[PDB]
Amino acid sequence: GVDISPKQDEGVLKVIKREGTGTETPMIGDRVFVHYTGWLLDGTKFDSSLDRKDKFSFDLGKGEVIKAWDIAVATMKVGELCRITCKPEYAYGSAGSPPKIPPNATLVFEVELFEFKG
Incomplete structure (x- = not known):
């Protein structure tokens, strides 16, 4: 249940x-x-x-998702789940998502993780 903001x-x-x-x-x-x-x-x-x-499915800091997913996935265990509550600095804040999001709108993602490396 961690925080860094x-x-x-x-x-x-x-x-x-x-x-x-x-x-x-x-x-x-x-x-x-x-x-x-x-x-x-x-x-x-x-x-x-x-x-x-x-x-x-993605690769941690390789193609790349959002910085809120690279921080929260780095701290997550094999098989279970967490809900992400993130600021636009770690997501769409620089330019906005093309169909609906502008440079200053906060986000919410409930993400499950099944398997990765070992």
């Missing part, structure tokens, strides 16, 4: 809901297989991979 200024609060089950947390440059739901700060759901049919 109203202290050092790294844009995020990651809530533990479903802890851990396998063997450890991932490393910088790791291949990871996730499942996400996500909302804007007004309570508006822009995406939900669970409803669309397929899953989400």
Whole structure:
């Protein structure tokens, strides 16, 4: 249930809901297989991979997602889940997401992690 923003200024609060089950947390440059739901700060759901049919998957600091996902995935264990509460510095704040988001709108992502490296 960690935080790195109203202290050092790294844009995020990651809530533990479903802890851990396998063997450890991932490393910088790791291949990871996730499942996400996500909302804007007004309570508006822009995406939900669970409803669309397929899953989400990335490589920690390689192609790249958002900095709030690289911070929260680095601190997450094999198989379980967490809800991300992040500032625009770690997400769309520099330019905005093309169909609906501008340079100053806070975010919310509930992300599950199944497997990564060991």
